[PDB]
């Protein structure tokens, strides 16, 4: 991104996901799947 | 007014309300920005 | 600072002394001598 440095970007995504975690089955996989680096899981 | 005009432009990529509006609505343009500024840092 | 990421800092500065230049004596001079780095003029 380019709004504001680098903050609001992946720690609102880890976050989102946390919250999934916390309260569907493919879909709450491939959340996590689909974003770690390219190979983590 | 050749850079006056270009900082309605350039302030906008950043709470000082009241101060940026009477920026972004404005001989008083060196006097405005040190204030704005010095409020800043 | 700490509001986007040094940007809109230095470069409103820069152009509002450029302003200066483009359009006082003494105080004319202190606004370019305090700001350059530590000891450019």
């Given at each position: 991104?380019?709004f504001?440095a680098?903050?609001?970007?992946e720690?609102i995504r880890?976050?989102?996901?946390?919250?999934?975690?916390?309260?569907?089955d493919?879909?709450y996989?491939?959340?996590?799947?689909?974003?770690?680096?390219?190979?983590?899981q | 007014?050749?850079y006056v005009?270009?900082?309605?432009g350039?302030i906008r990529?950043?709470?000082?309300?009241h101060?940026?509006?009477?920026f972004?609505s404005q001989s008083?343009?060196?006097?405005?920005?040190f204030?704005?500024?010095?409020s800043?840092?």
């Open positions: 991104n380019r504001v680098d903050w609001v970007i720690r880890w976050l989102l996901i946390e919250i999934l975690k916390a309260s569907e493919q879909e996989q491939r959340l996590i799947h689909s974003l770690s680096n390219v190979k983590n | 007014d050749e005009q270009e900082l309605k350039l990529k950043h709470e000082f309300g101060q940026k509006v009477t972004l008083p343009l060196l006097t405005e920005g204030k704005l500024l010095s800043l840092v």
